[PDB]
Write a protein that binds this DNA or RNA. Structure first.
Ligand SMILES: [Zn+2]
Lengths: 91, 86, 79, 92, 106, 98, 90, 78, 96
DNA sequence: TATTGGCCTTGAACGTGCCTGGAGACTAGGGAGTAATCCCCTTGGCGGTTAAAACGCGGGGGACAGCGCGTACGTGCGTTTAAGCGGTGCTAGAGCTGTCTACGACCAATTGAGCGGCCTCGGCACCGGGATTCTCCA
DNA sequence: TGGAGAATCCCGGTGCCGAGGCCGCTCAATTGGTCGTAGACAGCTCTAGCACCGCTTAAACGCACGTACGCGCTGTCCCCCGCGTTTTAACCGCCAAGGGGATTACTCCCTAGTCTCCAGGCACGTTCAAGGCCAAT
């Protein structure tokens, strides 16, 4: 499994007329996997510290705050909260 | 009575029954590494006689702590307790 | 302006523990800045941990986790 | 002007006690913490751990700074040595 | 009738795939209904930022495809991304052109 | 022998290590030999560090291990220095060098 | 929940006439917890790499070889193998 | 032996990419030694990973995992 | 004739604009195989493994050379010496 | 008078109660263990360029040592400053228990989104080639 | 400031190999209902964090002073740099033979799950010998 389709969709969203090479997709797949592993590990540690058996959007928010720099963490928190609210609004 | 001098013992001090006087004298002598030049009435007559009698009766030197750590119990704790069982 | 509570003799003592023989006169301000930068980065993560679990008092384990996150594992304060 | 410095180095490398007054450090810690959140509260153990970590970090940094100073044919440490040590250490 | 969770959340990254990865990754006994949405949104945001910077770097060199060097330039020229990706080496990335001022001729 | 440590000839709790492995989200299943191996490794490491600290404390005329002795034992051993190179010890000081 | 009893027994095995202080005991507890976490995490990663759903003594041995330095790794592997053999013998 | 395959011009090029302007005459032996130590560590970890998997062929994944274990995460090879 | 130091700067500018490997491939493969011989006999290598090892080694050496250049500049010099490498590796924490 | 004593502080070793987590036993189901087969994929030869490593050697710029000089840093003493150690008073908020509901695991149909294979053509690398600008000296 | 003269850039031509756009199908994402418990929520007990206050004394601060250390300058000799011949082994293309990695039926032992019994481990309160401090001497 890979993230090539989603990365290409995002690239077409940000840069309409711009392609990419295979090695660049390999690097981006490695980047996505690395960030996923970091955030998931931090969320698991946060859940274990507080003696809870569930990982919620709260643990994701706290892990994003812990792992990312200032402006990046702020923007990521805003985007994730907006996505969660939009998802919950529909059913 | 305290075998070192002959006064009333106060308890377990560096090996066995001794009094407060002999306990204090030993701890000062060991901590200060004091050296001098040579009965209850004569207990203050000469440091040498009391000191040599204290080493002679068998009361031990390594019971004193070089770093002077406070509290707890030393290696002779099990032995002290076994002797105190009697 | 409580950073000046880290007096010059204290910085000199810290340097002496590090084996420093001679100290310049401009060292102290730099040391104060470095200490402030370190403390900010530790305290930020400590407070972030404290906000989780809806607590108003910062615990020792919060600062222990904050230190361990930065590769500065500390022994002797629980955990 | 070298004997007292050597004696101080010996005593403070054998000393193993803390080297900063506790009340000013407490005030500085609370002043820094007030920025991120208001009406914060602290445990004594947290402040002790913060102080000990800070002292250890500063001692290590001073050791590296002394090494950098010696590399440049000197015995007096300067801010440039601290900056070089932190740069090679990777701290930003 | 069936709708994808990404469409409900308005995302491009998959929510079901992230949920499956979280479940199989041995992170928690249970996974909430909103955690994959948050994680996917964060990953999409980071990928979008990196893609924007890399595309600008590629456009600088008059190219229309992104290669590893453009990714390295974009990452190393941004302070926050550089701090995030500090202990990471990019294959076929190279280094930034940087010469000390003293080494230059007088 | 009822306790698993008695069967394994260890002084560390096999059952507690097994429970911590199970309730730690490491793997779906845990083998019967993993807790024994892990407990043995932990016991060996603790014994090594304690022996070095006791030797350090017995060099000087002391009779109780304080954190300074642990720091001296770890700093003066090449293997343990590499194992615990990024660890700060409470009230340990530094090596009397330089 | 702490390791004080077991660390005390190990100390009595090594130095029968040497005590320990409270802060040293806390440091030892932190050390044991740190080593446990490191080895367990390495074993979990090893099990995940090979698409295995179980953690066995092989993963623990490989993690010990990966983490500890040379002589420490050798002696730890020997002790763990001896313990596992004795336990299996029963 | 094979270490002399790492020639003086190769180390010169590597230093040139690093910004070094003037190089001494004893640099190359030091570079060879440090490269040997680094390669020894990485290859030891990779071979351990290969051995645990019941294999006789070293893959790229073993190298990547070994590099990640040293805090030298590498991108582009999976 | 170019004065000493012009060609060095030219090479510095040229080799910081490229991304190709700077070590010949066959000697590096032979060295890798010889080093791996002491760990297990009769080993096989995928091409990707050797490529990754080479990439990592070149990146590490370039970083070490940058640190060495900084150390040499600190001591009011232009020429790098082994002692600069030792100081950089000591401060980094690699050498004990 | 620098030495006797007497009372007071102290930190690991010991007892005691009780409860929650380890030990034993049994069963069901799936994860790990072996074979057999298939076919990439890794190793090993051979011969013709030809680019890269090796070599010689003159000289110029930089490493290194010696010496002089000015001031910044160390040292000591008198005098402020405030840290350190108690005692007392007063809550904010940590820490645990109970109820009960809202949410997430689990299973079975059902459907469509995403990997594999296969043309194809357009971005990008390579060659002249004159144009233009970095170095060097005299 | 000007003149050779190497290193470098701005220009088309060209063709080739990989980026990028379809198809078919299978396999993983979606729906819907039922059910058991994780976690939200409210309420109450009691630790402990934060305020003041007085007195004692060790650290902090100030100041005069003089010598050791940093830094600039000068000379000389080692030794790396730039360039022009020989020598060598790295690349490239082809090829062929296994060696080992990947996939699949299959079967059997290993580990999760539940229930019951009870002792190991934690929380205390209480030694208690040894170091510490004081006045009379
Ligand atoms: Zn007596």
């Amino acid at each position: 499994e890979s993230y090539s389709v989603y990365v290409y969709k995002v690239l077409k969203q940000v840069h309409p007329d711009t392609g990419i090479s295979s090695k660049a997709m390999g690097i981006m797949n490695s980047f996505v996997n690395d960030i996923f592993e970091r955030i998931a590990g931090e969320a698991s540690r946060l859940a274990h510290y507080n003696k809870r058996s569930t990982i919620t959007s709260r643990e994701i928010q706290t892990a994003v705050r812990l792992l990312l720099p200032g402006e990046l963490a702020k923007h990521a928190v805003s985007e994730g909260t907006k996505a969660v609210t939009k998802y919950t609004s529909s059913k | 009575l305290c075998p070192v001098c002959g006064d009333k013992v106060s308890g377990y001090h560096y090996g066995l029954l001794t009094c407060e006087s002999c306990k204090g004298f030993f701890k000062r002598t060991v901590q200060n590494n004091k050296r001098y030049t040579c009965d209850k009435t004569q207990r203050k007559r000469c440091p040498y006689c009391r000191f040599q009698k204290c080493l002679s009766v068998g009361m031990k030197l390594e019971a004193v702590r070089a770093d002077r750590m406070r509290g707890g119990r030393n290696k002779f704790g099990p032995m002290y307790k076994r002797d105190r069982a009697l | 302006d409580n950073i000046q509570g880290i007096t010059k003799p204290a910085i000199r003592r810290l340097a002496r523990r590090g084996g420093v023989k001679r100290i310049s006169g401009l060292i102290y301000e730099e040391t104060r800045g470095v200490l402030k930068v370190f403390l900010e980065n530790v305290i930020r993560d400590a407070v972030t941990y404290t906000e989780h679990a809806k607590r108003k008092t910062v615990t020792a384990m919060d600062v222990v986790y904050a230190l361990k996150r930065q590769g500065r594992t500390l022994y002797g304060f629980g955990g | 002007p070298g004997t007292v410095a050597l004696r101080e180095i010996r005593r403070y490398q054998k000393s193993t006690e803390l080297l900063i007054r506790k009340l000013p450090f407490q005030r500085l810690v609370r002043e820094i913490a007030q920025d991120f959140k208001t009406d914060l509260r602290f445990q004594s153990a947290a402040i002790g751990a913060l102080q000990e970590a800070s002292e250890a970090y500063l001692v290590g940094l001073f050791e590296d700074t002394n090494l950098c100073a010696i590399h440049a044919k000197r015995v007096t440490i300067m801010p440039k040595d601290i900056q070089l040590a932190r740069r090679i250490r990777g701290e930003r | 009738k069936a709708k994808t969770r990404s469409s409900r959340a308005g995302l491009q990254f998959p929510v079901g795939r992230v949920h499956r990865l979280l479940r199989k990754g041995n992170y928690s006994e249970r996974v909430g209904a909103g955690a994959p949405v948050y994680l996917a949104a964060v990953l999409e945001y980071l990928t979008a930022e990196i893609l924007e910077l890399a595309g600008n770097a590629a456009r600088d060199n008059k190219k229309t495809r992104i290669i590893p060097r453009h990714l390295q330039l974009a990452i190393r020229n941004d302070e926050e991304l550089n701090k995030l990706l500090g202990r990471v080496t990019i294959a076929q990335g190279g280094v930034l052109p940087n010469i000390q001022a003293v080494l230059l001729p007088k």
